[PDB]
UniProtKB/Swiss-Prot annotation:
There is a cross-link at K58 (Glycyl lysine isopeptide (Lys-Gly) (interchain with G-Cter in SUMO2)). JQ1, a thieno-triazolo-1,4-diazepine derivative, and I-BET, a benzodiazepine derivative, have been tested on tumors with success. Treatment with GSK1210151A (I-BET151, a I-BET derivative) has strong effets on mixed lineage leukemia and promotes myeloid differentiation and leukemia stem-cell depletion. The chain holds residues 44 to 168 of 1362 of the full protein. The gene is BRD4. It is linked to Cornelia de Lange syndrome 6: A form of Cornelia de Lange syndrome, a clinically heterogeneous developmental disorder associated with malformations affecting multiple systems. It is characterized by facial dysmorphisms, abnormal hands and feet, growth delay, cognitive retardation, hirsutism, gastroesophageal dysfunction and cardiac, ophthalmologic and genitourinary anomalies. CDLS6 inheritance is autosomal dominant. It comes from Homo sapiens (Human). This is Bromodomain-containing protein 4.
Length: 127
């Protein structure tokens, strides 16, 4: 069994910025979700070998996880907040597409998404 390489977290030729909106996405949004009791399944890429999910990467073609998002925020990978917000939404959507309603992993994603939506609702205006 085989995992794909993780998503890119470093690219010297990709343009990037340090902005108050991206600082908020690390300091408020990522920090809030990361410390949550249901964060652990989302803190690293889905390991299809260890989890015995040989079909995972047949169904999910844009993998994303909070470990990758945390690295992208800490290593200033992003140009804007929308790029980072899309990564969170990709992570949640992948969970809902692969799994079934009421599955433990879906209940965990739903709890994290509720907090995500609450925090993004108060995304500050650009300075
Ligand atoms: C389908 C799927 C996963 N499957 C396993 C799982 C399921 C529920 C809770 C926890 C884990 C887990 C987490 C880490 C290690 C071992 C099991 C796990 N994560 N995601 C995002 C999934 O979609």
């Amino acid at each position: 069994s085989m995992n794909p390489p993780p998503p890119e977290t470093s690219n010297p030729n990709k343009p990037k910025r340090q902005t108050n909106q991206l600082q908020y996405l690390l300091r408020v949004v990522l920090k809030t979700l990361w410390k949550h009791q249901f964060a652990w399944p989302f803190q690293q890429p889905v390991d299809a070998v260890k989890l015995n999910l040989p079909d995972y990467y047949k169904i999910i073609k844009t993998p994303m996880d909070m470990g990758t998002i945390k690295k992208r925020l800490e290593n200033n990978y992003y140009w804007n907040a929308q790029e980072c917000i899309q990564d969170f939404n990709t992570m949640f959507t992948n969970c809902y597409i692969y799994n079934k309603p009421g599955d433990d992993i879906v209940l965990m994603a739903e709890a994290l998404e509720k907090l995500f939506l609450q925090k993004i609702n108060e995304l500050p205006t650009e300075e």
